[PDB]
Structure formats: structure tokens, C-alpha cells
Design a protein around this ligand. Structure first.
Ligand SMILES: [Zn+2]
Ligand SMILES: [Zn+2]
Ligand SMILES: [Zn+2]
Ligand SMILES: [Zn+2]
Lengths: 119, 119, 119, 119
């Protein structure tokens, strides 16, 4: 796993985000078990509760590009700092990466099971 | 607008969907104002309320591919029938296509204004 | 249907909203087919996409208080002005009130079918 | 904390759920810092992704009944088994209960911090 290259893809995705309501763009990138990278950016909506997280876009892009399992994940904010996914996004990642998905956090790389136990 | 080509793209996207809980795959495709096509497929979740509609993935892909405004939209189910987006997805499409967005339905081509007035 | 009394319940609900992120509180009230009134207020979340609309809370309160069908609906903002529900909330109302649910709008009372056709 | 009384309330709420699509009713109950109990049940939707978890309805009811902070939480399925909230609902509970919120699980009483670290 090339974590700097994954973080670079996440920062590039962050630059594409639609976040005019919060002013808080987010980008995410993940390695799929076939070796390819998929990315997402957040897309906010005037009805706040319809906003899509970057991880939502990433999971949609996972299947649009052929499916598979996530093996490594990173998320970054508009300053390029590492972000831990919100609880909803942890649940999406669990479905497609499982407990052993590696998650890039500001405190260090963590298995998803350490971030969402008993899921 | 080449509606048959857009429907073919939506059906292609539908074949990639992750809908093991309902068994109801959905694909969507839309023309962007710069002329390119974006697509989405639905992605269900063990927690049903976390499922992403095909139109969610389509809007995520819109910005992942550089943004823009949507001008024409088609959605299809697993047997190729035209589907009308749910209310949530109508609101997502309103944000990025507005009332003039053309929606391919079994009743014909309808502007989004007629499917979600006063949004 | 006593529309002023329903709007009064909606404004009271609006005063209870949790909307620190947008500063945009919303209250909703509805008449159930058994004669009782149910209400909701919006509840925002630090992850914007997890925010619950007032109509979401209203539909949860509909079942917590015994279920039934909605017959009249009104939604108000922090100035007490009438609001049309977003597309997601129109879809929730359709499930529990159907096309003939009466919806209070600033332009006048409308059946839900006029706000969410072909649902 | 009277955990049996809280579980009885969650089971009561579960019996009111609207889950005709999955056939999987869920109820939740929580103690508020002022001492009162709030409850929720899940409400599914024909568009699966619009379903509301029991914890969504519980948080809606928290503010509908005057707000506060959650201190203890229990969730049960249709046979009375204790359920751990999905990631989305963990995030909702974090907003209104924080890491010290006590969560009733089959592994015992766990603080939310241990179920959703670094939120
Ligand atoms: Zn998220
Ligand atoms: Zn939809
Ligand atoms: Zn809404
Ligand atoms: Zn949940």
C-alpha cells in the first residue's frame, strides 16, 4: 500500500467537492482488492440531510467501476489533514471493506474494527 | 439529446448495482452541460436507510468528474423499464439540474419542474 | 381541518428544533385520520447528511403514537412562514398520506400529488 | 439506571414500528439527563434509503419533548434481543449523548466511546 499516493488522490478529489453550504470540502480515496483506486468527494444539498459524504461517493464509484472489496482508505479535509469518517460512512466502509479495512487517521493507520466495533 | 444512447448507459450502470437486499438493481445516466455522460447505480446497505440510490451515485460522479450542470436524465430498473426518481433524488437533481432538467419517463420527456414543483 | 391550529402546533414545534449548524429551525405538524395531531422539528448533525428534517421527526412521531394516515400537513420556518417540504420529505409524506394529503403552502393549500406527481 | 424498565420501553416502541419491507421491526429507548425516557421505532420507506432507524425517531422525539442530553440507551429487535446501533445511529447518539452515553449491548453496558471512537 502506497499511503502517500492514496492521500494524493484524496486531496485531488477534495478539490472537486461541492460544499457551498458548510464551506468544508472533503475528499476520499480507497484501494480496491484488484489494485485500482476509487475516489469520492462530498456533495452538499440545500436540504442538509440529503448531503452525500465523500465516502458515499467513493462507494458509488466502487460499483460503477466494477465492484470489489476495499482494502485501504483515506479521507482528507480542505487543509489536506486526515479525517476519520463519520459513523454513517464507517458503516458503508464496513459493508465493502469489513473489519480489516485499513483506515488512515491523524493518529495513525487503524483497522476499521477499531473504529466501528461489533458492526 | 440521444435518449436511446442515454438509456443504454443507464442500463449498463444498472448491471453494476449492489442490491442484494431488495434484489432490485437500478441504473441512472445523465448528460452534463459540457456534453459528457455521468452514471450511477444503487448501492444498498445492511442498514436499509443507508442505501444510496442510483441518482446519489450519479451526482457523486458528476463532481468526481469535474462538476457541471445536468441537462437530461434517465433511470432504469432491472428489466429496462424507465423509472421516475424518488422524491429524495428529485431534490438532488433539482440542485444540479434545476427545473429545466429533462427527465425520461414512461409518460414521455418531462421537465423536473413538473415532477418537483416549487422546490 | 383547522389550519390556523395546525400552523400554531408547527410554530411551537419549530421553537424546539436543533439547528445550530444552519441556524434554520423548522417545525411541522400534521393531522392524522383519527383526529390527533403529530409534530416534528428538524435535528441537524455535525455530519450534515445525517440531519433529520422536521417531516422525518413527524413521521417517526406518527408511528410512536399509534400509526395511521396523514390527512393535513403544514411546515413552517423560523419566521413562521409556510415551507414546502423538500423532495425527500414529500416522499415520506406520500408513503403515509398519499396523493390526496393536503399540504399547506405559501401559495395556498395543495394536494401532495400536485407537489410530487407519479410517486 | 433501570435497564429492565428501559428495555421494556424499547420493546413497547418496537411493537409500533413500520417495517413492512424488511419485516424487521426495531425499537429504541433512552434516558434523558432530566430523567425522562424517549423512544423511537423504525419507519421504512418504499425507497429503502429513505428509511428512518429507531434511533432517528428517538433523537427526533428528544427535541420534540424539549431537548436534553442522552445518558443511557437500549435498542431491541422483534424478538427482544439487544441490538447495537448501526454506524449512522452511533453518530446521531454521539451528537446528543457523547462518548459517555451508556449503550446496552449483548456484551454488556458499553460507553459510546468504545463503539464509535474519535467521532
Ligand atoms: Zn460520512
Ligand atoms: Zn431515490
Ligand atoms: Zn425534508
Ligand atoms: Zn441505524
Amino acid at each position: 500500500i502506497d499511503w502517500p499516493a492514496l492521500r494524493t488522490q484524496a486531496r485531488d478529489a477534495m478539490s472537486r467537492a461541492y460544499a457551498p453550504y458548510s464551506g468544508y470540502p472533503v475528499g476520499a480515496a480507497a484501494l480496491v482488492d484488484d489494485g485500482r483506486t476509487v475516489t469520492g468527494c462530498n456533495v452538499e444539498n440545500a436540504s442538509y440531510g440529503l448531503g452525500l459524504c465523500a465516502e458515499c461517493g467513493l462507494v458509488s464509484a466502487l460499483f460503477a467501476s466494477g465492484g470489489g472489496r476495499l482494502t485501504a482508505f483515506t479521507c482528507v479535509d480542505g487543509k489536506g489533514e486526515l479525517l476519520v469518517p463519520c459513523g454513517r460512512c464507517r458503516q458503508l466502509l464496513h459493508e465493502h471493506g469489513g473489519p480489516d479495512l485499513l483506515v488512515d487517521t491523524a493518529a495513525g493507520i487503524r483497522p476499521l474494527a477499531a473504529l466501528l466495533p461489533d458492526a
